[PDB]
Curated annotation (Swiss-Prot), chains A, C:
Function (record text): Involved in cytoskeletal rearrangements required for lymphocyte migration in response of chemokines. Activates RAC1 and RAC2, but not CDC42, by functioning as a guanine nucleotide exchange factor (GEF), which exchanges bound GDP for free GTP. May also participate in IL2 transcriptional activation via the activation of RAC2.
Full-protein interval shown: 1196 to 1622 of 1830
Protein origin, superkingdom: Eukaryota
Distribution of this protein across tissues and organs: Specifically expressed in hematopoietic cells. Highly expressed in peripheral blood leukocytes, and expressed at intermediate level in thymus and spleen. Expressed at very low level in the small intestine and colon.
Domain remark text: The DOCKER domain may mediate the GEF activity.
Medical condition linked: Immunodeficiency 40: A form of combined immunodeficiency characterized by lymphopenia, and defective T-cell, B-cell, and NK-cell responses. Patients suffer from severe invasive bacterial and viral infections in early childhood and may die without bone marrow transplantation.
Taxonomic placement: Eukaryota, Metazoa, Chordata, Craniata, Vertebrata
UniProt protein name: Dedicator of cytokinesis protein 2
Start and end residues of each DOCKER domain: 16-427
From Swiss-Prot, chains B, D:
Entry GO terms, CC: cell cortex; cell projection; cytoplasm; cytoplasmic ribonucleoprotein granule; cytoplasmic vesicle; cytoskeleton; cytosol; dendrite
Nucleotide-binding is among the record's keywords: yes
Tissue localization of expression: Isoform B is predominantly identified in skin and epithelial tissues from the intestinal tract. Its expression is elevated in colorectal tumors at various stages of neoplastic progression, as compared to their respective adjacent tissues.
The name this protein goes by in its record: Ras-related C3 botulinum toxin substrate 1
Membrane topology of this protein: Lipid-anchor
Assembly with partners or alone: Interacts with NISCH. Interacts with PIP5K1A. Interacts with the GTP-bound form of RAB7A. Interacts with SRGAP2. Interacts with CYFIP1/SRA-1. Interacts with PLXNB3. Interacts with ARHGDIA; the interaction is induced by SEMA5A, mediated through PLXNB3 and inactivates and stabilizes RAC1. Interacts (GTP-bound form preferentially) with PKN2 (via the REM repeats); the interaction stimulates autophosphorylation and phosphorylation of PKN2. Interacts with the GEF proteins PREX1, RASGRF2, FARP1, FARP2, DOCK1, DOCK2 and DOCK7, which promote the exchange between GDP and GTP, and therefore activate it.
Function: Plasma membrane-associated small GTPase which cycles between active GTP-bound and inactive GDP-bound states. In its active state, binds to a variety of effector proteins to regulate cellular responses such as secretory processes, phagocytosis of apoptotic cells, epithelial cell polarization, neurons adhesion, migration and differentiation, and growth-factor induced formation of membrane ruffles. Rac1 p21/rho GDI heterodimer is the active component of the cytosolic factor sigma 1, which is involved in stimulation of the NADPH oxidase activity in macrophages.
Record-listed Phosphoserine modification sites: 71
Extent of the signal sequence: none
Gene this protein is translated from: RAC1
Binding site residues for GTP: 12-18, 31-32, 34-35, 59-60, 116, 118-119, 158-160
Catalytic activity, EC: 3.6.5.2
Modified how: GTP-bound active form is ubiquitinated at Lys-147 by HACE1, leading to its degradation by the proteasome. Phosphorylated by AKT at Ser-71.
Mutagenesis or variant effect for residue 67 to A: Strongly reduced interaction with PLCB2
Length: 427, 177, 427, 177
C-alpha cells in the first residue's frame, strides 16, 4: 500500500520531469513529501524538497507562478523561497539525524548571509546552529540502519519491479524478520522465497510473484575529503553505514571435504556486490541495483578478513574507551576476553592448524604472501589486545578483578607464544 | 544506550555459538558465517528502548569448572541451554547449570532455552534416540523444568530454521529491564 | 621614549628582513609586540604577530629552530605553532575590537579543523566564537578613531623622518590637542608649526626641527565584496573609519569678494589627498605618506557636498532609529530641528541666494549640471526630514511635544515651498 | 556611554556657532569650515567617561524669544555666552539670558562663557571700544557675573586661537557627571 503508493507517486514525478511540466512535477514533489512525513521519514522528506530547491537560484528574480507550490502562492524572490525551503529541509535532516547534510545546507545559507544579503544576525544564528550540529555528530549516538536486498521475481509483478533487485534502507537496527513481515504485507499474492541465491529463468518467467529478501552490508564509499587525512572513528563510521551505494552479501560455501575438527579449513565465501542507482538515504527508502558482481573468497582470504576485522574492533573499542571514560566496562570485558581466550570457537590456532602446515604451502605456492599477511595480522593482534587490557585493568570493578587477573594471564601466555613464533609488533 | 550482560551456559551438544551468532548477525537461516572468536554483540530497540546486548559464550566443558564462573559477577540475565534432542543436557540443567549459576548469582534471572527444536520431529533423530531407549524433550517437560528451576521464561528455538530465535533475546532483555 | 624605541626596533626589523636573517627578524617581531602591549595597543600587537605567522605553513613539517621564538624552543609542527599564535592574535584583535580580522583568522582555523585535522570540538567552539564576533560588530559600539597628519621638517630630523609626512591613527577619544601634546614631548628640540600649508624650501632646508600637525579625514577604501551589494550602515560605516590608506584635509580659502550676508557664496575649499604606504591599523600607529595631491573646490561644489552629507546623516539616523526603538530622541531632535529650522546658520536658503541668481548662471554656464544636482539634493532633503519627523512624532516625550509641533510646522511650510520650487520626491 | 544635552544661549555678536563647530570638528585654529545648518555633536571622553554631547545652538534675536525655549526642556547643562569685547552682551547676560534660562530650567546647571578672548588685548578692538567710552570685560568682572547668576563655572576662551576652548565643554560635561 504505502510502499506501492510512493512508487506510483515517484513514477508520475518522473513522468512530469521527463515531459517538462514543472507545475505538476513540483506538485508531486509535495505529494511524496506528505507521504514521507506521514511515515515520519524526515530524511527522505528532506531529500524530496531538495528536488524543489534544485530549481531555485540564489537570485533576486521574482519566482515564477509555476515554480511555486499551489499552497504558498505569493510574490517571492528566488533567494527567499530557497531560503525558506532550506530552513524547512535543514529541520527535516535534523529530525532524521543526518547532520552532515544539515551542515552542508547551513553552509550555503551562511555564505548568502555573509557574502550576499549581509544579515549578521542570521549568520550568527546559523553558525551557532552549525556548532550544535558538529557537536551532535560527536556526542550523540546515531543508530546504524540495516540494509536489505529484495528481489521481485515473476511475471506477476509490474515492469518497474519485475525481476529486479532493490536495496532498502531499514529503520534503526531493524531486523530482516520484521522488515520482511511488513514487506510481505505489501504483497499478499507473493510467495516468500527460501534462498538468497539468484533464481533461474524458470522462476523469473513464472506468472506469479516470488520475493527474495536478505540482509546486506553497506560499503564505505570513496571520499576525497577523507583521503589521506586522519579522520576520527566517530566522524567516519557514520559514512561507513550511511550515504552509500555499494552493498555486499556473503554466503558460506563448503568446497573440498569438511574437516570436523577444523571447519575453517573448508569454508569458502560467495560474495555478491550490489550497486544502486542512487545512494541511500534519498527520496525513497529503496533504490534499484543497477550493477552486480560476484567473487569467491578462499578459506585463507576469509581467515585474513576475520583477523583484520577483529583487530579493527579492538582498535576502535580502545579509542572509544580512551576518549570517553564514563562508559560501562562490560562490553570491553566481553570483546577482549572473547579474543584472548576463545575457549569455545578456538581462535587463530584453527587458522594455524589449517594453513601453516607443509601440505598447504606446498599445494598453494601462489598463497605465500597471503600466508605471510595472516601471520602479520596475528603478530599485530597482540599489542592491540594488550593496549585494551591495560585499559581494562584501570576501569574494572572489584567484582571482576579475578576475571581480569585471569585475562591478563592468558594474554601474557599468548603474547609469549605468538611473539616467539610470528615476531614482535608495538603499536 | 543501556548495556546488558547476558551469559549463556549449558552443555557441548546444545550449539550455543550457532544460536548467538545466527541471531546477532541477522543472518539468513543456515547462512551464518562462524568465526574463531568468542561472544557477540547486538544492538536492538526492545520495548521502546535501545540497548546493547552483550552475549557471553561460556565453555560447558568440565575443564573450565573452576575458570568459567569468573565471568558471572555483574550478569544481568542468564540463558541456560539444552538440546531438546539431547536428554542428557536436559538433565544437566538441574544437575549442573542451575546449581552453578544460582551458587554465584542467587539474585540474577534465568531463561531456560531448548535448542535444536527443528530436530524433535526428525525421523532419523528420533530413531537414533530410540535405539538408546531415549525420547526427545517435550514442551511440557521443558516447562516443568523451567518452573522447577525458577526460570523466568521457558523458550524453544532453532538456529537453523531460526524459528523461536528472536524471541529468546527479546525475552532476555525483557527479563532485565 | 616609546615612539623612538619603536622606531629603532622597526628600523632594525626592516634591516633584518632585507638582510634575510630570520632569527633576528623574529626576535624583533617580538620586541615590537612587547612594546605594543606596553602601550596597550592590542591591534598593532596582533598585526605584528601576523608578520611571524606569515612564515608558517599549514603543515606537519617540524618547526625549524630559527622559525621558532627564543623562549619556546620545543618540537612543534608548523601547524601547531601557527594555530597557537592565531589563538593569541585573535585575542589581541578581540581587545582591539578589530572583529572583522578576528573573524578572518577564525575562518582560517575553522577550515583547518574541518578540512584538515578533523577536530569538531575545536570547530564547534570556533563557530560559536565567530557567531559572537558578528553579533559584536552588530550590537557593540566601536568609537570612531581620529587620524592626524604629522610633517617633520628641517635637517634636524633623522633621514627616515626628514621632510616627510605621516598619518597617525589616534587612540579612542584622543583629540589632536592630547595627541600633539604627548608627541612634542618626544621631540623636545622641535618647534611647533602654526600652519597646515605645505612649507617651502626655506623651512625644509633649515637646520632645526619643525613639526606640523593637523587632523585628517579617512576615505572609505574601495572594497570588492561590498560593490553592488546592499550593505548595512552598521557594517560599512566601520570601513569608513578603519582599514584605510587614503585621507583628505580641507582648508577653507576665500577668493574674491566676501558677502557679509552670504559667506557661503565666497568660500572655496583647498583639499589635499594623502595616501599611506600601508593601511591603518597596521604594524604601527603611523605610516608614511607616499602619494599626495591637491584639488580646489568651488563654493557651489562645496554646497553640493554639504547638502549631500546632511541628507546622508538624516538617512543614517532614520535607519538607526527604525532599527532600535530604545534609543533616546535628543540626537534626533537636535539633528532634525537643526536642519529644518536653521535660524542661526541660515539653511540652504543661502545656497539659493548664491548660486540660483540669473547672474550666477550667466556667469557660470559650465556649472549648469551641478546647479540641477543642487536643486535635486534640496528636493530630496524633504522626504528624508519628513521620515525623520514621523519617527520623532512617535517617540517624543510630553515635555518636548510643543517643540515637536513647532518642528512639524516649519517642516510642513518648508515642504510646501520646496515642492513648489524644485518639485516632489519620495522614499 | 552617556548622553548630554547642552544648550547654548547668548547675543549675536558673541559668535556661538564658530565656538561650537570648531570644538566639535577639532578643527585647526582658524581653519574651521562652516555649514548652513544648526547644532553639532561630539563623542568625547571626560575624566575617563565616554559621552555623546549634543550642542544645541539657539538664535539670540528677539523674534525668537517665543520659539527658542521650546528647546529647553530636559537640558543637562547650559552655556550662557557673552563676547568679552562687547559690554552690551555682558549686560544682556544679567538682563535677558540668565532670567530666561532660570525661568525655564530652575535647577539646571549653568556655565558662564566669555568669548573672543583673543580680542581683549587687541589694540584696535580696545580703541574702537574706547571711542564709545567702553572697555572689554575683565576676568574679575566676569567671575563676578558668574557668582551673581550662580554659574557653576566661569570660563574665557577664543574660538579662533582655540585657547580656552576644550575646557568649556570638559567643564560643561564635568558639571553633569
Amino acid at each position: 500500500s504505502k510502499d506501492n503508493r510512493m512508487s506510483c507517486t515517484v513514477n508520475l514525478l518522473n513522468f512530469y520531469k521527463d515531459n517538462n511540466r514543472e507545475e505538476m512535477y513540483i506538485r508531486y514533489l509535495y505529494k511524496l513529501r506528505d507521504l514521507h512525513l506521514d511515515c515520519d521519514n524526515y530524511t527522505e522528506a528532506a531529500y524530496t524538497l531538495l528536488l524543489h530547491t534544485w530549481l531555485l537560484k540564489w537570485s533576486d528574480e521574482q519566482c515564477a507562478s509555476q515554480v511555486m507550490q499551489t499552497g504558498q502562492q505569493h510574490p517571492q524572490t528566488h533567494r527567499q523561497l530557497k531560503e525558506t525551503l532550506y530552513e524547512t529541509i535543514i529541520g527535516y535532516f535534523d529530525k532524521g539525524k543526518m547532520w552532515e547534510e544539515a551542515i552542508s545546507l547551513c553552509k550555503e545559507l551562511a555564505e548568502q548571509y555573509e557574502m550576499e544579503i549581509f544579515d549578521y544576525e542570521l549568520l550568527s544564528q546559523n553558525l551557532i546552529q552549525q556548532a550544535k550540529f558538529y557537536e551532535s555528530i560527536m556526542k550523540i549516538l546515531r543508530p546504524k540502519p540495516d540494509y536489505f536486498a529484495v528481489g521481485y521475481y515473476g511475471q506477476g509483478f509490474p515492469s518497474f519491479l519485475r525481476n529486479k533487485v532493490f536495496i532498502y534502507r531499514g529503520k534503526e537496527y531493524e531486523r530482516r524478520e520484521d522488515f520482511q513481515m511488513q514487506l510481505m504485507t505489501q504483497f499478499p499474492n507473493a510467495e516468500k522465497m527460501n534462498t538468497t541465491s539468484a533464481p533461474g529463468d524458470d522462476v523469473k518467467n513464472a506468472p506469479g510473484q516470488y520475493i527474495q529478501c536478505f540482509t546486506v552490508q553497506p560499503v564505505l564509499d570513496e571520499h576525497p575529503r577523507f583521503k589521506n587525512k586522519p579522520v576520527p572513528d566517530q566522524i567516519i563510521n557514520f559514512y561507513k553505514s550511511n550515504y552509500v551505494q555499494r552493498f555486499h552479501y556473503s554466503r558460506p560455501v563448503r568446497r573440498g571435504t569438511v574437516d570436523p575438527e577444523n571447519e575453517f579449513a573448508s569454508m569458502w565465501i560467495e560474495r555478491t556486490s550490489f550497486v544502486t542507482a542512487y545512494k541511500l538515504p534519498g527520496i525513497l527508502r529503496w533504490f534499484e541495483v543497477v550493477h552486480m558482481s560476484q567473487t569467491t573468497i578462499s578459506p585463507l582470504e576469509n581467515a585474513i578478513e576475520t583477523m583484520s576485522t577483529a583487530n579493527e574492533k579492538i582498535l576502535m573499542m580502545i579509542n572509544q574507551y580512551q576518549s570517553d571514560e564514563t562508559l560501562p566496562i562490560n562490553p570491553l570485558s566481553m570483546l577482549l576476553n572473547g579474543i584472548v581466550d576463545p575457549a569455545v570457537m578456538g581462535g587463530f590456532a584453527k587458522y594455524e592448524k589449517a594453513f601453516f602446515t607443509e601440505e598447504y604451502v606446498r599445494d598453494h605456492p601462489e598463497d605465500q604472501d597471503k600466508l605471510t599477511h595472516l601471520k602479520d595480522l596475528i603478530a599485530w593482534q597482540i599489542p592491540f589486545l594488550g593496549a585494551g587490557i591495560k585499559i581494562h585493568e584501570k576501569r574494572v570493578s572489584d567484582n571482576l578483578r579475578p576475571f581480569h587477573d585471569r585475562m591478563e594471564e592468558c594474554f601474557k601466555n599468548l603474547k609469549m607464544k605468538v611473539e616467539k613464533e610470528y615476531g614482535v609488533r608495538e603499536m | 544506550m543501556q548495556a546488558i550482560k547476558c551469559v549463556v551456559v549449558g552443555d557441548g551438544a546444545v550449539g550455543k555459538n550457532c544460536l548467538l551468532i545466527s541471531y546477532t548477525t541477522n543472518a539468513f537461516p543456515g547462512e551464518y558465517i562462524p568465526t574463531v572468536f568468542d561472544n557477540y554483540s547486538a544492538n536492538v530497540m526492545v520495548d521502546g528502548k535501545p540497548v546493547n546486548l552483550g552475549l557471553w559464550d561460556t565453555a560447558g566443558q568440565e575443564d573450565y569448572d573452576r575458570l568459567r564462573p569468573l565471568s558471572y559477577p555483574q550478569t544481568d540475565v542468564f540463558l541456560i541451554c539444552f538440546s531438546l534432542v539431547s536428554p542428557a543436557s536436559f538433565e544437566n540443567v538441574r544437575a549442573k547449570w542451575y546449581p552453578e549459576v544460582r551458587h554465584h548469582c542467587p539474585n540474577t534471572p534465568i531463561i531456560l532455552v531448548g535448542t535444536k527444536l527443528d530436530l524433535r520431529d526428525d525421523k532419523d533423530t528420533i530413531e537414533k534416540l530410540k535405539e538408546k531407549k531415549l525420547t526427545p524433550i517435550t514442551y511440557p517437560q521443558g516447562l516443568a523444568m523451567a518452573k522447577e528451576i525458577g526460570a523466568v521464561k521457558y523458550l524453544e528455538c532453532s538456529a537453523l530454521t531460526q524459528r523461536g530465535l528472536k524471541t529468546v533475546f527479546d525475552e532476555a532483555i525483557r527479563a532485565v529491564l
